[PDB]
Amino acid sequence: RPALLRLSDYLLTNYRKGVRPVRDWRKPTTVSIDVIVYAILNVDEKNQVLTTYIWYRQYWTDEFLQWNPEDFDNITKLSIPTDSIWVPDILINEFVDVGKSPNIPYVYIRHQGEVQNYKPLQVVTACSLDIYNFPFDVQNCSLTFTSWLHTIQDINISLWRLPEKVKSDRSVFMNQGEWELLGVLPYFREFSMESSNYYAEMKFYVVIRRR
Amino acid sequence: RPALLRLSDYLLTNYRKGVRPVRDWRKPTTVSIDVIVYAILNVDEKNQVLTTYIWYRQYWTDEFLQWNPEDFDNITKLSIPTDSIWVPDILINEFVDVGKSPNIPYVYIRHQGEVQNYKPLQVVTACSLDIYNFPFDVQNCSLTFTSWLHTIQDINISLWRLPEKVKSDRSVFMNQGEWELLGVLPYFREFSMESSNYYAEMKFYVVIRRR
Amino acid sequence: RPALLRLSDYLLTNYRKGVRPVRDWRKPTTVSIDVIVYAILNVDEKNQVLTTYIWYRQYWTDEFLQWNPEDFDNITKLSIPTDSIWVPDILINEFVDVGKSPNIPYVYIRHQGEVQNYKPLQVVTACSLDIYNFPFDVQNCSLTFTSWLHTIQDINISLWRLPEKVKSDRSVFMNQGEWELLGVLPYFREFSMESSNYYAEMKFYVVIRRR
Amino acid sequence: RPALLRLSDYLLTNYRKGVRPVRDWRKPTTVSIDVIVYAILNVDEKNQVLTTYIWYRQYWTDEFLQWNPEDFDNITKLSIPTDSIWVPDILINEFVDVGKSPNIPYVYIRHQGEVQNYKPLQVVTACSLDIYNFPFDVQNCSLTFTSWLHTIQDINISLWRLPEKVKSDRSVFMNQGEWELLGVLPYFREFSMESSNYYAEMKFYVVIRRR
Amino acid sequence: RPALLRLSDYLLTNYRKGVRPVRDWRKPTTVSIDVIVYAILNVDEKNQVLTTYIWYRQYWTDEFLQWNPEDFDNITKLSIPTDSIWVPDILINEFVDVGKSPNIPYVYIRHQGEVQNYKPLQVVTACSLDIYNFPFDVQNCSLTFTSWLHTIQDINISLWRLPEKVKSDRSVFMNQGEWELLGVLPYFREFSMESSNYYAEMKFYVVIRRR
Ligand SMILES: *[C@@H]1O[C@H](CO)[C@@H](O[C@@H]2O[C@H](CO)[C@@H](O)[C@H](O)[C@H]2NC(C)=O)[C@H](O)[C@H]1NC(C)=O
Ligand SMILES: *[C@@H]1O[C@H](CO)[C@@H](O[C@@H]2O[C@H](CO)[C@@H](O)[C@H](O)[C@H]2NC(C)=O)[C@H](O)[C@H]1NC(C)=O
Numbered sequence A, B, C, D, E: 001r002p003a004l005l006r007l008s009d010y011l012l013t014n015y016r017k018g019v020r021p022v023r024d025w026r027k028p029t030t031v032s033i034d035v036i037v038y039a040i041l042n043v044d045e046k047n048q049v050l051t052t053y054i055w056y057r058q059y060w061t062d063e064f065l066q067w068n069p070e071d072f073d074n075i076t077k078l079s080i081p082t083d084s085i086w087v088p089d090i091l092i093n094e095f096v097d098v099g100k101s102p103n104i105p106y107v108y109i110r111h112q113g114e115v116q117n118y119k120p121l122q123v124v125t126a127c128s129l130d131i132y133n134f135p136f137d138v139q140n141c142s143l144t145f146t147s148w149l150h151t152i153q154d155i156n157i158s159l160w161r162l163p164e165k166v167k168s169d170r171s172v173f174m175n176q177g178e179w180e181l182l183g184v185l186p187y188f189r190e191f192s193m194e195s196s197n198y199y200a201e202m203k204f205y206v207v208i209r210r211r
């Protein structure tokens, strides 16, 4: 048997996707996320919505999906379908349409249990857009990523990279459109409405000025 | 075996989603629902429809999905996929398009059998919108949630929170659009057209005035 | 074991959805349908199409899905997923878009074998719409429901209610739009193009006048 | 056991849908197709596309799905789900959008192995549309049906009816729109770009003149 | 048993789609791709996007899906569903909408392990489109195909045909629209942002001038 088949069987023959992947339920499943803005397709002042094509990547630890490489021909990482494992319900609020985003089939996994998921997002978000300074307008829209259902005690959200590095990330931006990206400011806040439930969310402020 | 895996197996290995989850068929499955209006994307007087992005949550009791925590490492609640259990067919009438709403994978469950489902709704509804007072127009549109098929003897709908608390809920509303939310008035009515079938529905009146 | 679980197992453990549910293949599967017009969202004279939100219900007999209540705690009816049983391919011709209609998960079943399916339809249909009498225009569009594939010898279509009762049904119509419903006239005709195939269809004429 | 259940089991318990249904791989799977134009919803000169609602039917031979009627209560034909058998990948080129077409669940089968599939098509096609003779314009758009992947040695396309009968078929056309159908001219051609691959396609020229 | 059934069983009874199909994980899975532009449906200068209907074909080697023909009635190639095997996640960046593309069910396979996949693409891409020379405008938009997740060490992209042959390929182009195709220039580049990850992508520049 090839090493990849042996590893895939050893991992997925005694694993189910319904549960949260932690040996002890008392610890939360920390999730690290990163956001890169690839392009700004449209900014609609009439409907007060804008469309952003952002490259979204996140990683977390699956305490069940771990192995010793030396028993599997020194395989340090491998790719398996995303639908065959647990995936956090980290969803972006303020959204109005996300069907344009295709579902990426595969995700990378490492022998430590770390799971890496790279996916695109064609999300269109609703935010306040004033046209007061139309000729030299500058807008401030926010993207907030949160565990839609799980509380902070179950899922927590952190940053993959340092805040300053992602704040001035224009490496892959399409810098030929009507809008110019000035920065992507992250922000962490604990969101709570009930007297006992606290939810963790990460706000990304996309700052753009017209040209 | 970890406690979560043992509990998930003990629950879902002797459970099927086709049936209504009640030990005795003679009792109805009471469902408690709540509605929070997150934003009002569009109000179309031409087509007599308006779009509301509302945060919808509901809970009910699954008399099969109950356990004693002390036998499962004091696990009081856990999350499992929504497609692995019975879910009431509580659908909103007056609707014209609901495909924009994504399907939330997971739902929370407690050892008492209570099931909590949090989902978003991008429903666009058809209702009478007069433009008689255009400059200072005030509109009155209604959202009615009902068990589409099940009668009152099978599914009944109630309110999660007290009517007054939800009537003046502007905690998460996007209060920067063209429309301002004045209140969300609930109302319970037994709907019957045949001589023997009674259906329970809950009407939510979204009161909005232009600005 | 609870009665519902026992009944569901007894029914679906020896049943498959591919076949037409009849003990003898020589008899047709009579289907009774009813149509209620809930609203008329749009009437497009430019594209010669109109959109109707109609509440559609139908029932038929599954000769396999029958039981004696006294052996199942006097259960006279129960609900199971619609995808777990055979469903007739009764489709509406003249259609141009039906994706807006959501798929109802559950259907009601009775111990006699009768299956009741209640579903909504957001169908937009193409029909001749003249604007000759624009100010006082009256239109005559038709909805025809037919077994798309099965012939009359396999599937036949009938009326749930008497023709006169459905002809003057304005009980749930949204009587506040630009159009007023005058009647819904049914009509049964055997449709045949080949020399040996006869298909049964039921035409519903929606009569509307502007206001 | 009822005859239908016995036949369905005998057929589908030793059958899989992945393969091409032929006892000997050396023979092609001849497919006969027919096209009936039900209506012409739109003809867009701006985008150089037109929408045609055509009734599409095809049949082919499944050498595995054959039986002797006398052993199954003289059952000469039966209907089973289309997703439970092999279906040719006969797709229409020049297309721009086909999502509007619903998926028909069932297909008819005969004891000889013949499979009959009736499905609708809401295809919108891109073709050259000149507006030179606008007031009395006549257009010539083409629909070509081909085995998208399989070569002629695997799948071949033929005509269900004689070319002249389908060429003057206006039996079910909606002859009340802006366009009038003059004919549907078929044409068979072997399409080859590589030095060894030949693909069979059938071109249907829809001839229409404005009125 | 027919040869096709025996071969399909022998192949798919000891094969799973999750893993990358290579006997040794240390070697990359080279993928050869080709692009043919069938038509240019729309070029939107307002939204800075254009729609291209391109015929996309690719092939790769599955080291598990190989056999000796002489043991299977000299079967040199056969077709099986695309969802039953591993398929590379070769996705086109700069995209804005790909849902219009239908999913081709079957793919061709040869006894050497080679897998051939032919699929259409209705991708709409975002690229800089200047209207400076409107009357005689010439545009330069790019399509880049990359392994979205897998690095170069896992998936690599090459050209099926020689660069010059694909650069002047107008064999199946719809040369009757507003735009004329001047060439499709390929280009290979190793894309890397992290200090250790290198991804292989192939850029196709579609050169078009108005007429
Ligand atoms: C959830 O994650 C956030 C972000 O990683 C945590 O907030 C940080 O916690 C560390 C350690 O307590 C502090 O040094 C930082 O100042 C906090 N803020 C940020 C922005 O890093 C938070 O403590 C985590 N909570 C739980 C329950 O895991
Ligand atoms: C866009 O909005 C964000 C959030 O309100 C602004 O970020 C804050 O700016 C204030 C300015 O005094 C700082 O004190 C905060 O520390 C910032 N917060 C974060 C998380 O960075 C941002 O400045 C706004 N941009 C523009 C151009 O107005």
Ligand SMILES: *[C@@H]1O[C@H](CO)[C@@H](O[C@@H]2O[C@H](CO)[C@@H](O)[C@H](O)[C@H]2NC(C)=O)[C@H](O)[C@H]1NC(C)=O
Pocket: B028, B152, B153, B156, B157, B158, B159, B188, B200
């Ligand atoms: C279905 O639920 C509704 C709402 O919970 C019930 O209506 C209430 O019933 C209680 C007790 O009978 C009354 O005190 C309230 O005044 C009723 N109205 C409201 C708005 O709470 C109804 O009785 C339930 N019916 C069934 C069959 O369960």
Ligand SMILES: *[C@@H]1O[C@H](CO)[C@@H](O[C@@H]2O[C@H](CO)[C@@H](O)[C@H](O)[C@H]2NC(C)=O)[C@H](O)[C@H]1NC(C)=O
Pocket: B138, B140, B185, B186, B187, B205, B207
């Ligand atoms: C919007 O419509 C609702 C329902 O018709 C109104 O709510 C009712 O208002 C009347 C006013 O006399 C009260 O007597 C009822 O008790 C109310 N019913 C409920 C369930 O609250 C509401 O007032 C309307 N709003 C506006 C601004 O006209």
Ligand SMILES: *[C@@H]1O[C@H](CO)[C@@H](O[C@@H]2O[C@H](CO)[C@@H](O)[C@H](O)[C@H]2NC(C)=O)[C@H](O)[C@H]1NC(C)=O
Pocket: C028, C152, C153, C156, C157, C158, C159, C188, C200
């Ligand atoms: C298919 O159903 C239709 C409608 O139920 C049948 O047509 C009726 O048949 C009865 C009895 O023969 C007549 O009394 C009615 O006048 C017919 N028309 C209507 C509108 O009810 C038809 O006979 C059925 N055919 C088959 C083969 O079952």
Ligand SMILES: *[C@@H]1O[C@H](CO)[C@@H](O[C@@H]2O[C@H](CO)[C@@H](O)[C@H](O)[C@H]2NC(C)=O)[C@H](O)[C@H]1NC(C)=O
Pocket: C138, C140, C185, C186, C187, C205, C207
């Ligand atoms: C709309 O069209 C239907 C069908 O053509 C009309 O219904 C027929 O009307 C004629 C009038 O003489 C009657 O003789 C038929 O018996 C009717 N058929 C049915 C099935 O009811 C209807 O009258 C038309 N409505 C309008 C307003 O013109």
Ligand SMILES: *[C@@H]1O[C@H](CO)[C@@H](O[C@@H]2O[C@H](CO)[C@@H](O)[C@H](O)[C@H]2NC(C)=O)[C@H](O)[C@H]1NC(C)=O
Pocket: D028, D152, D153, D156, D157, D158, D159, D188, D200
């Ligand atoms: C594929 O099918 C086409 C159409 O049925 C075949 O073309 C016909 O072949 C017959 C017999 O050779 C001729 O008499 C006709 O003149 C041909 N044309 C038409 C329009 O019928 C073709 O031979 C078939 N090829 C294969 C390999 O099966």
Ligand SMILES: *[C@@H]1O[C@H](CO)[C@@H](O[C@@H]2O[C@H](CO)[C@@H](O)[C@H](O)[C@H]2NC(C)=O)[C@H](O)[C@H]1NC(C)=O
Pocket: D138, D140, D185, D186, D187, D205, D207
């Ligand atoms: C539409 O185009 C088709 C295909 O080019 C035409 O059909 C051909 O017409 C020529 C006229 O001399 C004949 O010689 C061919 O035999 C026809 N081919 C087929 C397959 O029928 C058709 O005439 C065109 N229609 C119009 C109105 O121009």
Ligand SMILES: *[C@@H]1O[C@H](CO)[C@@H](O[C@@H]2O[C@H](CO)[C@@H](O)[C@H](O)[C@H]2NC(C)=O)[C@H](O)[C@H]1NC(C)=O
Pocket: E028, E152, E153, E156, E157, E158, E159, E188, E200
């Ligand atoms: C990935 O594939 C590309 C293209 O096939 C390779 O690049 C070529 O490599 C060959 C041999 O090293 C050179 O002769 C060519 O000049 C290269 N460029 C092109 C455009 O062909 C690349 O080496 C491959 N890399 C890996 C790791 O497999």
Ligand SMILES: *[C@@H]1O[C@H](CO)[C@@H](O[C@@H]2O[C@H](CO)[C@@H](O)[C@H](O)[C@H]2NC(C)=O)[C@H](O)[C@H]1NC(C)=O
Pocket: E138, E140, E185, E186, E187, E205, E207
């Ligand atoms: C469109 O853009 C491509 C890429 O920038 C151009 O292709 C390059 O053109 C330069 C011209 O000096 C050559 O030196 C490069 O070798 C070309 N690269 C490739 C990969 O072919 C192309 O010329 C542009 N077309 C137009 C009309 O401007």
Ligand SMILES: Cc1ccc(Sc2ccccc2N2CCNCC2)c(C)c1
Pocket: A146, A147, A148, A149, A193, A194, A199, B036, B055, B056, B057, B118, B119, B171, B172
């Ligand atoms: C009173 C109150 C309680 C809770 C909430 S929150 C919420 C409500 C419904 C559906 C989903 C949510 N969310 C939970 C955490 N993830 C984001 C959405 C509110 C608004 C009021």
Ligand SMILES: Cc1ccc(Sc2ccccc2N2CCNCC2)c(C)c1
Pocket: B146, B147, B148, B149, B193, B194, B199, C036, C055, C056, C057, C118, C119, C120, C171, C172
């Ligand atoms: C005469 C009559 C009987 C019943 C109804 S109701 C209905 C009809 C068709 C499809 C669905 C329904 N519903 C049932 C309960 N849930 C909401 C929809 C009518 C209108 C007339």
Ligand SMILES: Cc1ccc(Sc2ccccc2N2CCNCC2)c(C)c1
Pocket: C146, C147, C148, C149, C193, C194, C199, D036, D055, D056, D057, D118, D119, D120, D172
């Ligand atoms: C000559 C001829 C034969 C049959 C028909 S019918 C048809 C054709 C193709 C696809 C579907 C159908 N239908 C069958 C019954 N259900 C409605 C649609 C025609 C038009 C001509």
Ligand SMILES: Cc1ccc(Sc2ccccc2N2CCNCC2)c(C)c1
Pocket: D146, D147, D148, D149, D193, D194, D199, E036, E055, E056, E057, E118, E119, E120, E171, E172
């Ligand atoms: C050089 C060359 C070779 C083959 C083709 S064909 C093609 C190409 C890609 C994807 C699909 C196809 N098709 C095959 C048969 N069915 C219709 C589409 C071309 C254009 C050039």
Ligand SMILES: Cc1ccc(Sc2ccccc2N2CCNCC2)c(C)c1
Pocket: A036, A055, A056, A057, A118, A119, A171, A172, E146, E147, E148, E149, E193, E194, E199
């Ligand atoms: C700092 C940095 C690191 C990696 C990338 S890449 C990327 C990021 C998120 C999601 C997907 C990707 N991709 C990987 C390879 N395939 C194309 C997309 C960037 C932009 C910055």
Ligand SMILES: *[C@@H]1O[C@H](CO)[C@@H](O)[C@H](O)[C@H]1NC(C)=O
Pocket: A070, A073, A074
């Ligand atoms: C795996 O790695 C260890 C440490 O580098 C080495 O000793 C061993 O030979 C390797 N085994 C294989 C099969 O590569």
Ligand SMILES: *[C@@H]1O[C@H](CO)[C@@H](O)[C@H](O)[C@H]1NC(C)=O
Pocket: B070, B073, B074
């Ligand atoms: C569970 O809770 C009970 C009561 O608080 C306690 O006695 C017991 O030790 C707990 N068990 C575990 C495993 O935490």
Ligand SMILES: *[C@@H]1O[C@H](CO)[C@@H](O)[C@H](O)[C@H]1NC(C)=O
Pocket: C070, C073, C074
């Ligand atoms: C079922 O109904 C019959 C007739 O009414 C009655 O005699 C019997 O006791 C009932 N059984 C149960 C369990 O309700």
